Amino acid sequence: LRYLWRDYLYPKQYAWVLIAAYVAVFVVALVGNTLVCLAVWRNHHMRTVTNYFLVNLSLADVLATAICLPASLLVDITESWLFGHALCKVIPYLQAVSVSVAVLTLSFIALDRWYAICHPLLFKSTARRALGSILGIWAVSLAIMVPQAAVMECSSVLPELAARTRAFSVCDERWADDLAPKIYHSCFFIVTYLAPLGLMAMAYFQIFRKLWGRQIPGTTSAEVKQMRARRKTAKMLMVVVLVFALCYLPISVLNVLKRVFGMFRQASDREAVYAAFTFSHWLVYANSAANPIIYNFLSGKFREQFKAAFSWWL
Ligand SMILES: CCCCCCCC/C=C\CCCCCCCC(=O)O[C@H](COC(=O)CCCCCCCCCCCCCCC)COP(=O)(O)OC[C@@H](O)CO
Ligand SMILES: COc1ccc(-n2nccn2)c(C(=O)N2CCC[C@@]2(C)c2nc3ccc(Cl)c(C)c3[nH]2)c1
Ligand SMILES: CCCCCCCCS[C@@H]1O[C@H](CO)[C@@H](O)[C@H](O)[C@H]1O
Ligand SMILES: CCCCCCCCS[C@@H]1O[C@H](CO)[C@@H](O)[C@H](O)[C@H]1O
Ligand SMILES: CCCCCCCCS[C@@H]1O[C@H](CO)[C@@H](O)[C@H](O)[C@H]1O
Ligand SMILES: CCCCCCCCS[C@@H]1O[C@H](CO)[C@@H](O)[C@H](O)[C@H]1O
Ligand SMILES: CCCCCCCCS[C@@H]1O[C@H](CO)[C@@H](O)[C@H](O)[C@H]1O
Ligand SMILES: CCCCCCCCS[C@@H]1O[C@H](CO)[C@@H](O)[C@H](O)[C@H]1O
Numbered sequence: 617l618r619y620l621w622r623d624y625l626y627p628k629q630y631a632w633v634l635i636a637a638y639v640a641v642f643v644v645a646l647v648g649n650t651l652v653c654l655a656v657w658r659n660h661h662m663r664t665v666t667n668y669f670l671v672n673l674s675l676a677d678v679l680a681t682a683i684c685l686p687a688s689l690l691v692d693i694t695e696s697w698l699f700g701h702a703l704c705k706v707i708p709y710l711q712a713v714s715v716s717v718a719v720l721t722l723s724f725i726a727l728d729r730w731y732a733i734c735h736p737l738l739f740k741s742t743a744r745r746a747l748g749s750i751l752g753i754w755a756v757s758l759a760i761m762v763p764q765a766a767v768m769e770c771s772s773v774l775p776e777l778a779a780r781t782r783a784f785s786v787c788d789e790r791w792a793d794d795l796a797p798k799i800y801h802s803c804f805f806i807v808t809y810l811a812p813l814g815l816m817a818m819a820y821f822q823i824f825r826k827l828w829g830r831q832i833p834g835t836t837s838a839e840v841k842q843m844r845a846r847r848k849t850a851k852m853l854m855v856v857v858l859v860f861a862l863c864y865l866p867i868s869v870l871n872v873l874k875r876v877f878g879m880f881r882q883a884s885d886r887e888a889v890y891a892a893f894t895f896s897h898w899l900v901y902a903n904s905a906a907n908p909i910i911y912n913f914l915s916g917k918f919r920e921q922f923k924a925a926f927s928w929w930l
Contacts, residue, residue: 648908655921677904697787709765716757801875863903
């Protein structure tokens with residue numbers, strides 16, 4: 617009486633809205649993140665340790681936007697994998713790498729700020745060390761997401777059907793046992809979301825208490841200027857971390873409930889579940905669009921470069 621899987625199989629009633637949201641995010645993130653790289657290239661005064669990490673973040677974001685976003689939209693619209701076995705492993709792999717790169721870049725920004733502000737003369741923070749750390753971030757991210765690429769498999773509902781069309785193919789994780797996905801997704805959630813964001817929250821709170829706390833009696837002019845500039849960057853970075861945690865919260869929670877707790881298997885609520893996952897996928901991409909916008913409103917330096925770029929191209 618209520619089984620209409622094919623009516624929504626081709627297009628969904630919210631399908632156009634999803635296409636518009638995806639395209640809007642695609643354009644904004646590509647232009648904006650390119651502007652983040654070009655701003656840091658243009659202004660030599662902005663080539664700081666934090667800003668070097670921020671374009672690393674913009675590189676990770678551009679990787680996911682250019683390659684993963686188009687594929688994700690297609691998957692969410694058609695509920696089928698039309699790009700073959702190799703890309704079934706590559707595109708989810710690149711998304712996993714992009715997530716790792718982003719969270720570790722934010723972790724290293726928080727760590728730099730925390731040692732710079734709360735434990736000042738222990739570690740030396742140079743832009744050369746920052747480029748070394750950026751290389752390390754990619755090395756780690758590329759290595760640790762190989763298991764994810766290994767588990768991805770493209771499969772059609774009826775195996776001889778894959779020989780005629782890709783229309784009934786599906787890209788998903790293939791797990792030999794019930795326990796392995798539970799351990800894997802528990803570790804994926806903790807390592808790429810919970811633990812780094814918990815640690816970053818505590819770091820930014822300590823940074824906040826030092827920057828907005830008890831002023832040391834009789835500070836110099838140069839010390840108050842240092843504090844004011846650090847307050848500007850800290851305010852922005854806390855917004856970037858908060859937006860990241862908000863964007864990634866739905867999909868992280870959803871995947872945990874699905875993979876660790878075995879939820880959303882029930883056929884009664886399929887439609888609702890698919891809506892939830894679809895939206896969750898989108899804001900992952902929405903975050904890539906949001907970061908340049910954040911810099912425009914909270915960094916006068918970034919705003920200046922963006923204004924100049926808009927004047928040049930318009
Ligand atoms: C390796 C892979 C991941 C990548 C990791 C990279 C991440 C790197 C990012 C930032 C580095 C900065 C570290 C932050 C420093 C931690 C700051 C901190 O300890 O928080 C305090 C209290 O909070 C407290 O309730 C302490 C209890 C913590 C609350 C427990 C909730 C779990 C959070 C879940 C997080 C997982 C933890 C991971 C550990 C390995 C603040 O108050 P308060 O000024 O009084 O202190 C006085 C103090 O000097 C005590 O002598
Ligand atoms: C469209 O599906 C997505 C989009 C974003 C995702 N995501 N963003 C942040 C965290 N997870 C996920 C997702 O849950 N996971 C869990 C492990 C593998 C990973 C990262 C994955 N990335 C993908 C990228 C594109 C495509 Cl097309 C598929 C099928 C992907 N699967 C799925
Ligand atoms: C100018 C008026 C246009 C009317 C044409 C409408 C096209 C509907 S086709 C119909 O769509 C369903 C899903 O949308 C599927 O269940 C069926 O397989 C398919 O046959
Ligand atoms: C959405 C952005 C992702 C890029 C998608 C572009 C389509 C690539 S075609 C693809 O090339 C692969 C070569 O290895 C094979 O899997 C198949 O022969 C073929 O179908
Ligand atoms: C009962 C299920 C219906 C299966 C029949 C669909 C016929 C295949 S059409 C089409 O043939 C093209 C040739 O170029 C390929 O490129 C595509 O993969 C495929 O989509
Ligand atoms: C000695 C170290 C061996 C390292 C090899 C990885 C651990 C194997 S577990 C097993 O691997 C399958 C592949 O067959 C996955 O698809 C399953 O989900 C998973 O349960
Ligand atoms: C070397 C590779 C190791 C991969 C892990 C082994 C796969 C078997 S998991 C299996 O799952 C059940 C719950 O699903 C548990 O009750 C059992 O105790 C356990 O035996
Ligand atoms: C003899 C009775 C048979 C029991 C089989 C043991 C299976 C326990 S797996 C366990 O299931 C939870 C669901 O509540 C998940 O949350 C956990 O992550 C996961 O580790």
